[PDB]
RNA sequence: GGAAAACUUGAGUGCAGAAGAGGAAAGUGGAAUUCCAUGUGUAGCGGUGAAAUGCGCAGAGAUAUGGAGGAACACCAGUGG
């Protein structure tokens, strides 16, 4: 089980959740990013993806996987403070992938915020 | 003004080629919001200028080889055509 996997996050503008999994997704543990008492304008922190990143990473305890190769699929304030700060656990982050959804003009997008 | 002609610039009928988002018809595939299901797990997830309604204990989202739908299809994109 150990030494391989994907630290599958999707770092949104609020509540960048972290789900560690394998290289074929099975989600050994995940972490809700509001687990540090972040409720309103608070999960958009560096620290929502610093310690709640390792509230499932340091508390993995199931595979003991060490090579993580974290993957991000969205923009957020805790994005650069997620891939750095999943390695706040010190879990040898190796291969970050910017495989984000880029639709070739996918649908009809919503309205401007006045 | 009418009567008898011509020339071709102006226009049309020729010939050699350039380009395309020009209108009506057939294909190839991507990515996304929504759903139902696996794995997964349990405290929050979403939304907030400020919090909350809500959606959460059914697993809500999550997460990938991979299951689908609606609809269009960034890149070539321009005082371009």
mmCIF file with all atom_site columns, C-alpha atoms (C1' of nucleotides) in Angstrom:
data_model
loop_
_atom_site.group_PDB
_atom_site.id
_atom_site.type_symbol
_atom_site.label_atom_id
_atom_site.label_alt_id
_atom_site.label_comp_id
_atom_site.label_asym_id
_atom_site.label_entity_id
_atom_site.label_seq_id
_atom_site.pdbx_PDB_ins_code
_atom_site.Cartn_x
_atom_site.Cartn_y
_atom_site.Cartn_z
_atom_site.occupancy
_atom_site.B_iso_or_equiv
_atom_site.pdbx_formal_charge
_atom_site.auth_seq_id
_atom_site.auth_comp_id
_atom_site.auth_asym_id
_atom_site.auth_atom_id
_atom_site.pdbx_PDB_model_num
ATOM 1   C CA    . UNK A 1 1   ? 0.000   0.000  0.000   1.00 0.00 ? 1   UNK A CA    1
ATOM 2   C CA    . UNK A 1 2   ? 2.811   2.366  0.970   1.00 0.00 ? 2   UNK A CA    1
ATOM 3   C CA    . UNK A 1 3   ? 5.126   4.579  -1.148  1.00 0.00 ? 3   UNK A CA    1
ATOM 4   C CA    . UNK A 1 4   ? 2.654   5.440  -3.914  1.00 0.00 ? 4   UNK A CA    1
ATOM 5   C CA    . UNK A 1 5   ? -0.534  7.417  -4.260  1.00 0.00 ? 5   UNK A CA    1
ATOM 6   C CA    . UNK A 1 6   ? -2.063  10.755 -5.176  1.00 0.00 ? 6   UNK A CA    1
ATOM 7   C CA    . UNK A 1 7   ? -2.731  13.544 -2.699  1.00 0.00 ? 7   UNK A CA    1
ATOM 8   C CA    . UNK A 1 8   ? -5.897  14.543 -4.543  1.00 0.00 ? 8   UNK A CA    1
ATOM 9   C CA    . UNK A 1 9   ? -6.950  18.064 -3.668  1.00 0.00 ? 9   UNK A CA    1
ATOM 10  C CA    . UNK A 1 10  ? -9.172  20.462 -5.591  1.00 0.00 ? 10  UNK A CA    1
ATOM 11  C CA    . UNK A 1 11  ? -8.165  23.789 -4.066  1.00 0.00 ? 11  UNK A CA    1
ATOM 12  C CA    . UNK A 1 12  ? -11.217 26.000 -4.419  1.00 0.00 ? 12  UNK A CA    1
ATOM 13  C CA    . UNK A 1 13  ? -11.678 29.634 -3.439  1.00 0.00 ? 13  UNK A CA    1
ATOM 14  C CA    . UNK A 1 14  ? -13.225 28.416 -0.194  1.00 0.00 ? 14  UNK A CA    1
ATOM 15  C CA    . UNK A 1 15  ? -12.551 25.142 1.645   1.00 0.00 ? 15  UNK A CA    1
ATOM 16  C CA    . UNK A 1 16  ? -9.681  23.523 -0.225  1.00 0.00 ? 16  UNK A CA    1
ATOM 17  C CA    . UNK A 1 17  ? -10.376 19.890 0.673   1.00 0.00 ? 17  UNK A CA    1
ATOM 18  C CA    . UNK A 1 18  ? -7.616  17.297 0.678   1.00 0.00 ? 18  UNK A CA    1
ATOM 19  C CA    . UNK A 1 19  ? -8.228  13.626 -0.079  1.00 0.00 ? 19  UNK A CA    1
ATOM 20  C CA    . UNK A 1 20  ? -5.223  11.335 -0.048  1.00 0.00 ? 20  UNK A CA    1
ATOM 21  C CA    . UNK A 1 21  ? -5.708  8.305  -2.273  1.00 0.00 ? 21  UNK A CA    1
ATOM 22  C CA    . UNK A 1 22  ? -3.846  5.819  -4.470  1.00 0.00 ? 22  UNK A CA    1
ATOM 23  C CA    . UNK A 1 23  ? -2.793  6.212  -8.086  1.00 0.00 ? 23  UNK A CA    1
ATOM 24  C CA    . UNK A 1 24  ? -6.221  4.645  -8.783  1.00 0.00 ? 24  UNK A CA    1
ATOM 25  C CA    . UNK A 1 25  ? -8.625  6.668  -6.642  1.00 0.00 ? 25  UNK A CA    1
ATOM 26  C CA    . UNK A 1 26  ? -9.886  4.968  -3.490  1.00 0.00 ? 26  UNK A CA    1
ATOM 27  C CA    . UNK A 1 27  ? -9.633  7.809  -0.919  1.00 0.00 ? 27  UNK A CA    1
ATOM 28  C CA    . UNK A 1 28  ? -8.017  6.349  2.231   1.00 0.00 ? 28  UNK A CA    1
ATOM 29  C CA    . UNK A 1 29  ? -8.894  9.510  4.168   1.00 0.00 ? 29  UNK A CA    1
ATOM 30  C CA    . UNK A 1 30  ? -10.163 12.970 3.345   1.00 0.00 ? 30  UNK A CA    1
ATOM 31  C CA    . UNK A 1 31  ? -10.283 16.215 5.253   1.00 0.00 ? 31  UNK A CA    1
ATOM 32  C CA    . UNK A 1 32  ? -12.942 18.876 5.254   1.00 0.00 ? 32  UNK A CA    1
ATOM 33  C CA    . UNK A 1 33  ? -11.016 22.135 5.192   1.00 0.00 ? 33  UNK A CA    1
ATOM 34  C CA    . UNK A 1 34  ? -13.224 23.838 7.775   1.00 0.00 ? 34  UNK A CA    1
ATOM 35  C CA    . UNK A 1 35  ? -12.063 21.411 10.477  1.00 0.00 ? 35  UNK A CA    1
ATOM 36  C CA    . UNK A 1 36  ? -10.009 24.161 12.152  1.00 0.00 ? 36  UNK A CA    1
ATOM 37  C CA    . UNK A 1 37  ? -13.129 26.062 13.192  1.00 0.00 ? 37  UNK A CA    1
ATOM 38  C CA    . UNK A 1 38  ? -13.322 27.904 9.865   1.00 0.00 ? 38  UNK A CA    1
ATOM 39  C CA    . UNK A 1 39  ? -16.913 28.968 9.169   1.00 0.00 ? 39  UNK A CA    1
ATOM 40  C CA    . UNK A 1 40  ? -17.210 32.337 7.407   1.00 0.00 ? 40  UNK A CA    1
ATOM 41  C CA    . UNK A 1 41  ? -14.419 34.029 5.401   1.00 0.00 ? 41  UNK A CA    1
ATOM 42  C CA    . UNK A 1 42  ? -12.096 31.692 7.308   1.00 0.00 ? 42  UNK A CA    1
ATOM 43  C CA    . UNK A 1 43  ? -11.684 28.565 5.159   1.00 0.00 ? 43  UNK A CA    1
ATOM 44  C CA    . UNK A 1 44  ? -10.089 30.865 2.564   1.00 0.00 ? 44  UNK A CA    1
ATOM 45  C CA    . UNK A 1 45  ? -6.908  30.741 4.621   1.00 0.00 ? 45  UNK A CA    1
ATOM 46  C CA    . UNK A 1 46  ? -3.403  29.484 4.104   1.00 0.00 ? 46  UNK A CA    1
ATOM 47  C CA    . UNK A 1 47  ? -4.046  27.573 7.329   1.00 0.00 ? 47  UNK A CA    1
ATOM 48  C CA    . UNK A 1 48  ? -7.169  25.759 6.145   1.00 0.00 ? 48  UNK A CA    1
ATOM 49  C CA    . UNK A 1 49  ? -4.741  23.873 3.899   1.00 0.00 ? 49  UNK A CA    1
ATOM 50  C CA    . UNK A 1 50  ? -1.850  23.813 6.415   1.00 0.00 ? 50  UNK A CA    1
ATOM 51  C CA    . UNK A 1 51  ? -3.049  21.748 9.384   1.00 0.00 ? 51  UNK A CA    1
ATOM 52  C CA    . UNK A 1 52  ? -6.326  20.389 8.062   1.00 0.00 ? 52  UNK A CA    1
ATOM 53  C CA    . UNK A 1 53  ? -4.104  19.256 5.207   1.00 0.00 ? 53  UNK A CA    1
ATOM 54  C CA    . UNK A 1 54  ? -2.287  17.158 7.788   1.00 0.00 ? 54  UNK A CA    1
ATOM 55  C CA    . UNK A 1 55  ? -5.393  16.368 9.813   1.00 0.00 ? 55  UNK A CA    1
ATOM 56  C CA    . UNK A 1 56  ? -5.658  13.551 7.251   1.00 0.00 ? 56  UNK A CA    1
ATOM 57  C CA    . UNK A 1 57  ? -2.031  13.445 6.034   1.00 0.00 ? 57  UNK A CA    1
ATOM 58  C CA    . UNK A 1 58  ? -0.207  13.009 9.350   1.00 0.00 ? 58  UNK A CA    1
ATOM 59  C CA    . UNK A 1 59  ? -3.252  11.005 10.449  1.00 0.00 ? 59  UNK A CA    1
ATOM 60  C CA    . UNK A 1 60  ? -3.085  8.697  7.431   1.00 0.00 ? 60  UNK A CA    1
ATOM 61  C CA    . UNK A 1 61  ? -2.159  5.608  9.514   1.00 0.00 ? 61  UNK A CA    1
ATOM 62  C CA    . UNK A 1 62  ? -3.614  3.195  6.936   1.00 0.00 ? 62  UNK A CA    1
ATOM 63  C CA    . UNK A 1 63  ? -1.246  2.822  3.980   1.00 0.00 ? 63  UNK A CA    1
ATOM 64  C CA    . UNK A 1 64  ? 1.792   4.644  5.325   1.00 0.00 ? 64  UNK A CA    1
ATOM 65  C CA    . UNK A 1 65  ? 2.272   6.009  1.806   1.00 0.00 ? 65  UNK A CA    1
ATOM 66  C CA    . UNK A 1 66  ? 5.183   8.435  1.560   1.00 0.00 ? 66  UNK A CA    1
ATOM 67  C CA    . UNK A 1 67  ? 5.523   9.412  -2.110  1.00 0.00 ? 67  UNK A CA    1
ATOM 68  C CA    . UNK A 1 68  ? 2.424   11.548 -2.571  1.00 0.00 ? 68  UNK A CA    1
ATOM 69  C CA    . UNK A 1 69  ? 2.580   13.491 -5.923  1.00 0.00 ? 69  UNK A CA    1
ATOM 70  C CA    . UNK A 1 70  ? -0.176  15.961 -5.028  1.00 0.00 ? 70  UNK A CA    1
ATOM 71  C CA    . UNK A 1 71  ? -2.627  17.104 -7.746  1.00 0.00 ? 71  UNK A CA    1
ATOM 72  C CA    . UNK A 1 72  ? -4.477  20.450 -7.769  1.00 0.00 ? 72  UNK A CA    1
ATOM 73  C CA    . UNK A 1 73  ? -7.541  21.099 -9.929  1.00 0.00 ? 73  UNK A CA    1
ATOM 74  C CA    . UNK A 1 74  ? -8.676  24.622 -9.104  1.00 0.00 ? 74  UNK A CA    1
ATOM 75  C CA    . UNK A 1 75  ? -7.792  28.156 -8.008  1.00 0.00 ? 75  UNK A CA    1
ATOM 76  C CA    . UNK A 1 76  ? -7.753  29.278 -4.398  1.00 0.00 ? 76  UNK A CA    1
ATOM 77  C CA    . UNK A 1 77  ? -5.995  31.215 -1.631  1.00 0.00 ? 77  UNK A CA    1
ATOM 78  C CA    . UNK A 1 78  ? -4.866  28.002 -0.007  1.00 0.00 ? 78  UNK A CA    1
ATOM 79  C CA    . UNK A 1 79  ? -3.451  26.620 -3.261  1.00 0.00 ? 79  UNK A CA    1
ATOM 80  C CA    . UNK A 1 80  ? 0.220   27.600 -3.064  1.00 0.00 ? 80  UNK A CA    1
ATOM 81  C CA    . UNK A 1 81  ? -0.308  27.250 0.689   1.00 0.00 ? 81  UNK A CA    1
ATOM 82  C CA    . UNK A 1 82  ? -1.613  23.741 0.067   1.00 0.00 ? 82  UNK A CA    1
ATOM 83  C CA    . UNK A 1 83  ? 1.138   22.081 -1.970  1.00 0.00 ? 83  UNK A CA    1
ATOM 84  C CA    . UNK A 1 84  ? 3.720   23.753 0.216   1.00 0.00 ? 84  UNK A CA    1
ATOM 85  C CA    . UNK A 1 85  ? 1.499   23.170 3.225   1.00 0.00 ? 85  UNK A CA    1
ATOM 86  C CA    . UNK A 1 86  ? 0.553   19.570 2.689   1.00 0.00 ? 86  UNK A CA    1
ATOM 87  C CA    . UNK A 1 87  ? 4.305   19.242 3.112   1.00 0.00 ? 87  UNK A CA    1
ATOM 88  C CA    . UNK A 1 88  ? 3.822   21.079 6.383   1.00 0.00 ? 88  UNK A CA    1
ATOM 89  C CA    . UNK A 1 89  ? 3.389   17.449 7.414   1.00 0.00 ? 89  UNK A CA    1
ATOM 90  C CA    . UNK A 1 90  ? 6.712   16.945 5.633   1.00 0.00 ? 90  UNK A CA    1
ATOM 91  C CA    . UNK A 1 91  ? 5.482   14.195 3.355   1.00 0.00 ? 91  UNK A CA    1
ATOM 92  C CA    . UNK A 1 92  ? 8.003   14.622 0.461   1.00 0.00 ? 92  UNK A CA    1
ATOM 93  C CA    . UNK A 1 93  ? 5.815   16.374 -2.093  1.00 0.00 ? 93  UNK A CA    1
ATOM 94  C CA    . UNK A 1 94  ? 7.249   15.391 -5.460  1.00 0.00 ? 94  UNK A CA    1
ATOM 95  C CA    . UNK A 1 95  ? 5.024   15.944 -8.521  1.00 0.00 ? 95  UNK A CA    1
ATOM 96  C CA    . UNK A 1 96  ? 2.498   18.770 -8.585  1.00 0.00 ? 96  UNK A CA    1
ATOM 97  C CA    . UNK A 1 97  ? 0.131   18.656 -11.570 1.00 0.00 ? 97  UNK A CA    1
ATOM 98  C CA    . UNK A 1 98  ? -1.879  21.617 -12.870 1.00 0.00 ? 98  UNK A CA    1
ATOM 99  C CA    . UNK A 1 99  ? -4.546  19.377 -14.386 1.00 0.00 ? 99  UNK A CA    1
ATOM 100 C CA    . UNK A 1 100 ? -7.400  21.816 -13.918 1.00 0.00 ? 100 UNK A CA    1
ATOM 101 C CA    . UNK A 1 101 ? -10.720 21.926 -15.828 1.00 0.00 ? 101 UNK A CA    1
ATOM 102 C CA    . UNK A 1 102 ? -10.186 24.004 -18.956 1.00 0.00 ? 102 UNK A CA    1
ATOM 103 C CA    . UNK A 1 103 ? -13.319 23.595 -21.067 1.00 0.00 ? 103 UNK A CA    1
ATOM 104 C CA    . UNK A 1 104 ? -13.089 24.802 -24.617 1.00 0.00 ? 104 UNK A CA    1
ATOM 105 C CA    . UNK A 1 105 ? -16.005 27.195 -23.824 1.00 0.00 ? 105 UNK A CA    1
ATOM 106 C CA    . UNK A 1 106 ? -17.964 24.520 -22.017 1.00 0.00 ? 106 UNK A CA    1
ATOM 107 C CA    . UNK A 1 107 ? -21.450 25.915 -21.379 1.00 0.00 ? 107 UNK A CA    1
ATOM 108 C CA    . UNK A 1 108 ? -23.208 29.250 -21.018 1.00 0.00 ? 108 UNK A CA    1
ATOM 109 C CA    . UNK A 1 109 ? -21.499 30.797 -17.949 1.00 0.00 ? 109 UNK A CA    1
ATOM 110 C CA    . UNK A 1 110 ? -23.364 32.878 -15.295 1.00 0.00 ? 110 UNK A CA    1
ATOM 111 C CA    . UNK A 1 111 ? -23.997 36.621 -14.988 1.00 0.00 ? 111 UNK A CA    1
ATOM 112 C CA    . UNK A 1 112 ? -21.815 39.499 -13.784 1.00 0.00 ? 112 UNK A CA    1
ATOM 113 C CA    . UNK A 1 113 ? -21.898 40.286 -10.064 1.00 0.00 ? 113 UNK A CA    1
ATOM 114 C CA    . UNK A 1 114 ? -23.101 43.856 -9.562  1.00 0.00 ? 114 UNK A CA    1
ATOM 115 C "C1'" . G   B 2 1   ? -35.276 65.919 -79.875 1.00 0.00 ? 1   G   B "C1'" 1
ATOM 116 C "C1'" . G   B 2 2   ? -35.579 62.058 -83.666 1.00 0.00 ? 2   G   B "C1'" 1
ATOM 117 C "C1'" . A   B 2 3   ? -32.264 59.587 -88.166 1.00 0.00 ? 3   A   B "C1'" 1
ATOM 118 C "C1'" . A   B 2 4   ? -28.148 56.546 -89.544 1.00 0.00 ? 4   A   B "C1'" 1
ATOM 119 C "C1'" . A   B 2 5   ? -22.080 54.215 -86.882 1.00 0.00 ? 5   A   B "C1'" 1
ATOM 120 C "C1'" . A   B 2 6   ? -17.824 53.098 -83.907 1.00 0.00 ? 6   A   B "C1'" 1
ATOM 121 C "C1'" . C   B 2 7   ? -14.459 52.924 -79.228 1.00 0.00 ? 7   C   B "C1'" 1
ATOM 122 C "C1'" . U   B 2 8   ? -13.809 51.003 -74.568 1.00 0.00 ? 8   U   B "C1'" 1
ATOM 123 C "C1'" . U   B 2 9   ? -12.083 52.549 -69.858 1.00 0.00 ? 9   U   B "C1'" 1
ATOM 124 C "C1'" . G   B 2 10  ? -17.895 52.107 -67.029 1.00 0.00 ? 10  G   B "C1'" 1
ATOM 125 C "C1'" . A   B 2 11  ? -20.537 47.601 -66.759 1.00 0.00 ? 11  A   B "C1'" 1
ATOM 126 C "C1'" . G   B 2 12  ? -21.307 42.532 -68.144 1.00 0.00 ? 12  G   B "C1'" 1
ATOM 127 C "C1'" . U   B 2 13  ? -19.744 37.509 -70.608 1.00 0.00 ? 13  U   B "C1'" 1
ATOM 128 C "C1'" . G   B 2 14  ? -13.644 35.211 -70.717 1.00 0.00 ? 14  G   B "C1'" 1
ATOM 129 C "C1'" . C   B 2 15  ? -9.229  33.028 -68.735 1.00 0.00 ? 15  C   B "C1'" 1
ATOM 130 C "C1'" . A   B 2 16  ? -4.895  32.064 -63.747 1.00 0.00 ? 16  A   B "C1'" 1
ATOM 131 C "C1'" . G   B 2 17  ? -5.264  31.895 -58.700 1.00 0.00 ? 17  G   B "C1'" 1
ATOM 132 C "C1'" . A   B 2 18  ? -5.822  33.641 -52.964 1.00 0.00 ? 18  A   B "C1'" 1
ATOM 133 C "C1'" . A   B 2 19  ? -8.586  33.548 -48.521 1.00 0.00 ? 19  A   B "C1'" 1
ATOM 134 C "C1'" . G   B 2 20  ? -12.446 32.816 -44.765 1.00 0.00 ? 20  G   B "C1'" 1
ATOM 135 C "C1'" . A   B 2 21  ? -16.681 33.103 -38.729 1.00 0.00 ? 21  A   B "C1'" 1
ATOM 136 C "C1'" . G   B 2 22  ? -21.087 33.548 -45.936 1.00 0.00 ? 22  G   B "C1'" 1
ATOM 137 C "C1'" . G   B 2 23  ? -26.143 30.721 -45.656 1.00 0.00 ? 23  G   B "C1'" 1
ATOM 138 C "C1'" . A   B 2 24  ? -28.564 25.336 -45.607 1.00 0.00 ? 24  A   B "C1'" 1
ATOM 139 C "C1'" . A   B 2 25  ? -26.897 19.504 -44.404 1.00 0.00 ? 25  A   B "C1'" 1
ATOM 140 C "C1'" . A   B 2 26  ? -23.421 14.649 -42.332 1.00 0.00 ? 26  A   B "C1'" 1
ATOM 141 C "C1'" . G   B 2 27  ? -18.998 13.100 -38.723 1.00 0.00 ? 27  G   B "C1'" 1
ATOM 142 C "C1'" . U   B 2 28  ? -14.895 13.415 -34.808 1.00 0.00 ? 28  U   B "C1'" 1
ATOM 143 C "C1'" . G   B 2 29  ? -13.403 14.168 -29.952 1.00 0.00 ? 29  G   B "C1'" 1
ATOM 144 C "C1'" . G   B 2 30  ? -12.001 17.241 -25.514 1.00 0.00 ? 30  G   B "C1'" 1
ATOM 145 C "C1'" . A   B 2 31  ? -13.323 19.874 -21.048 1.00 0.00 ? 31  A   B "C1'" 1
ATOM 146 C "C1'" . A   B 2 32  ? -16.893 21.414 -17.732 1.00 0.00 ? 32  A   B "C1'" 1
ATOM 147 C "C1'" . U   B 2 33  ? -22.307 22.563 -13.979 1.00 0.00 ? 33  U   B "C1'" 1
ATOM 148 C "C1'" . U   B 2 34  ? -26.423 18.425 -12.851 1.00 0.00 ? 34  U   B "C1'" 1
ATOM 149 C "C1'" . C   B 2 35  ? -27.626 13.269 -11.624 1.00 0.00 ? 35  C   B "C1'" 1
ATOM 150 C "C1'" . C   B 2 36  ? -27.431 8.164  -10.122 1.00 0.00 ? 36  C   B "C1'" 1
ATOM 151 C "C1'" . A   B 2 37  ? -23.353 4.166  -8.221  1.00 0.00 ? 37  A   B "C1'" 1
ATOM 152 C "C1'" . U   B 2 38  ? -18.628 2.134  -6.597  1.00 0.00 ? 38  U   B "C1'" 1
ATOM 153 C "C1'" . G   B 2 39  ? -14.115 3.160  -3.359  1.00 0.00 ? 39  G   B "C1'" 1
ATOM 154 C "C1'" . U   B 2 40  ? -13.808 6.557  0.602   1.00 0.00 ? 40  U   B "C1'" 1
ATOM 155 C "C1'" . G   B 2 41  ? -15.348 8.519  5.183   1.00 0.00 ? 41  G   B "C1'" 1
ATOM 156 C "C1'" . U   B 2 42  ? -17.690 11.727 9.168   1.00 0.00 ? 42  U   B "C1'" 1
ATOM 157 C "C1'" . A   B 2 43  ? -17.666 16.551 10.490  1.00 0.00 ? 43  A   B "C1'" 1
ATOM 158 C "C1'" . G   B 2 44  ? -18.973 19.711 8.951   1.00 0.00 ? 44  G   B "C1'" 1
ATOM 159 C "C1'" . C   B 2 45  ? -19.781 21.030 2.832   1.00 0.00 ? 45  C   B "C1'" 1
ATOM 160 C "C1'" . G   B 2 46  ? -21.558 25.120 0.464   1.00 0.00 ? 46  G   B "C1'" 1
ATOM 161 C "C1'" . G   B 2 47  ? -22.620 30.559 0.628   1.00 0.00 ? 47  G   B "C1'" 1
ATOM 162 C "C1'" . U   B 2 48  ? -21.154 35.129 2.869   1.00 0.00 ? 48  U   B "C1'" 1
ATOM 163 C "C1'" . G   B 2 49  ? -18.461 42.973 2.251   1.00 0.00 ? 49  G   B "C1'" 1
ATOM 164 C "C1'" . A   B 2 50  ? -20.695 40.542 7.742   1.00 0.00 ? 50  A   B "C1'" 1
ATOM 165 C "C1'" . A   B 2 51  ? -22.566 36.139 9.302   1.00 0.00 ? 51  A   B "C1'" 1
ATOM 166 C "C1'" . A   B 2 52  ? -26.584 33.000 8.277   1.00 0.00 ? 52  A   B "C1'" 1
ATOM 167 C "C1'" . U   B 2 53  ? -30.810 30.221 5.167   1.00 0.00 ? 53  U   B "C1'" 1
ATOM 168 C "C1'" . G   B 2 54  ? -29.331 25.879 2.861   1.00 0.00 ? 54  G   B "C1'" 1
ATOM 169 C "C1'" . C   B 2 55  ? -26.951 21.316 1.846   1.00 0.00 ? 55  C   B "C1'" 1
ATOM 170 C "C1'" . G   B 2 56  ? -24.502 17.247 6.298   1.00 0.00 ? 56  G   B "C1'" 1
ATOM 171 C "C1'" . C   B 2 57  ? -24.659 11.445 9.343   1.00 0.00 ? 57  C   B "C1'" 1
ATOM 172 C "C1'" . A   B 2 58  ? -28.799 8.193  4.267   1.00 0.00 ? 58  A   B "C1'" 1
ATOM 173 C "C1'" . G   B 2 59  ? -22.516 9.441  3.577   1.00 0.00 ? 59  G   B "C1'" 1
ATOM 174 C "C1'" . A   B 2 60  ? -24.128 15.355 1.690   1.00 0.00 ? 60  A   B "C1'" 1
ATOM 175 C "C1'" . G   B 2 61  ? -19.443 17.093 -1.880  1.00 0.00 ? 61  G   B "C1'" 1
ATOM 176 C "C1'" . A   B 2 62  ? -14.755 14.417 -2.309  1.00 0.00 ? 62  A   B "C1'" 1
ATOM 177 C "C1'" . U   B 2 63  ? -11.897 11.057 -5.183  1.00 0.00 ? 63  U   B "C1'" 1
ATOM 178 C "C1'" . A   B 2 64  ? -10.067 7.951  -10.416 1.00 0.00 ? 64  A   B "C1'" 1
ATOM 179 C "C1'" . U   B 2 65  ? -9.225  3.500  -14.700 1.00 0.00 ? 65  U   B "C1'" 1
ATOM 180 C "C1'" . G   B 2 66  ? -13.514 4.270  -15.436 1.00 0.00 ? 66  G   B "C1'" 1
ATOM 181 C "C1'" . G   B 2 67  ? -21.145 5.496  -15.994 1.00 0.00 ? 67  G   B "C1'" 1
ATOM 182 C "C1'" . A   B 2 68  ? -24.469 8.866  -18.269 1.00 0.00 ? 68  A   B "C1'" 1
ATOM 183 C "C1'" . G   B 2 69  ? -27.055 13.613 -19.385 1.00 0.00 ? 69  G   B "C1'" 1
ATOM 184 C "C1'" . G   B 2 70  ? -27.987 19.519 -20.969 1.00 0.00 ? 70  G   B "C1'" 1
ATOM 185 C "C1'" . A   B 2 71  ? -25.287 22.650 -24.191 1.00 0.00 ? 71  A   B "C1'" 1
ATOM 186 C "C1'" . A   B 2 72  ? -21.516 24.850 -26.490 1.00 0.00 ? 72  A   B "C1'" 1
ATOM 187 C "C1'" . C   B 2 73  ? -16.648 23.891 -28.163 1.00 0.00 ? 73  C   B "C1'" 1
ATOM 188 C "C1'" . A   B 2 74  ? -10.671 28.750 -24.847 1.00 0.00 ? 74  A   B "C1'" 1
ATOM 189 C "C1'" . C   B 2 75  ? -5.673  27.494 -28.206 1.00 0.00 ? 75  C   B "C1'" 1
ATOM 190 C "C1'" . C   B 2 76  ? -4.799  29.306 -34.304 1.00 0.00 ? 76  C   B "C1'" 1
ATOM 191 C "C1'" . A   B 2 77  ? -8.287  35.000 -32.266 1.00 0.00 ? 77  A   B "C1'" 1
ATOM 192 C "C1'" . G   B 2 78  ? -6.471  40.133 -35.318 1.00 0.00 ? 78  G   B "C1'" 1
ATOM 193 C "C1'" . U   B 2 79  ? -7.747  49.059 -36.188 1.00 0.00 ? 79  U   B "C1'" 1
ATOM 194 C "C1'" . G   B 2 80  ? -7.951  40.051 -39.335 1.00 0.00 ? 80  G   B "C1'" 1
ATOM 195 C "C1'" . G   B 2 81  ? -11.195 38.322 -43.530 1.00 0.00 ? 81  G   B "C1'" 1
#
